[PDB]
Design a protein around this ligand. Structure first.
Ligand SMILES: [Zn+2]
Length: 173
């Protein structure tokens, strides 16, 4: 039942500028938003995408909302910067990943199933269309930066996902 909604679908303001990266993304980075909290109705979710984009563009002076895609409590996927566009959600990975933010604070509570499935479907489609490398590596934001994101509970959940990985599984500069 999960649909991919376009930027226009949620009333997104235009990017101030769009940078690109080539090839299929070798990484998928999972985030939670922390604030806003989980949204359950599509209209609340569309406003949460708007609130994050306002905060990003207007208050942080970024070109657009920092993530590639957002996932709402309504089970819908929301287009952010989209595939193959450099993001602003994970330093050193912005030009080689798909940053997916599950809307809400997931440090302790587990995201409802429709959200988990939506993120899986989004990734599957990414690989199906060639936007995500078939040997992609799945990570949580905390593994590449000093942050608690995507929350302890959501992080334990993604560690059970196919392709999940730990950077230090590999030794060597
Ligand atoms: Zn994050």
């Amino acid at each position: 039942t999960a649909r991919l909604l376009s930027r226009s679908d949620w009333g997104a303001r235009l990017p101030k500028s769009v940078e690109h990266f080539q090839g299929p993304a070798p990484y998928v980075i999972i985030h939670h938003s922390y604030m806003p909290a989980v949204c359950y109705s599509t209209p609340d979710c569309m406003k949460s995408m708007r609130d994050m984009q306002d905060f990003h563009q207007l208050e942080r002076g970024w070109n657009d909302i920092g993530y590639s895609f957002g996932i709402g409590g309504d089970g819908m996927i929301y287009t952010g910067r989209g595939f193959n566009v450099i993001g602003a959600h994970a330093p050193k990975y912005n030009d080689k990943s798909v940053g997916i933010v599950l809307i809400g604070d997931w440090r302790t509570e587990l995201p409802p199933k429709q959200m988990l499935d939506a993120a899986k479907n989004l990734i599957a489609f990414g690989v199906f269309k060639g936007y995500i490398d078939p040997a992609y590596k799945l990570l949580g934001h905390r593994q590449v930066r000093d942050t608690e994101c995507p929350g302890g509970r959501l992080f334990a959940e993604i560690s059970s996902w196919p392709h999940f990985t730990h950077i230090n599984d590999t030794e060597g500069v």
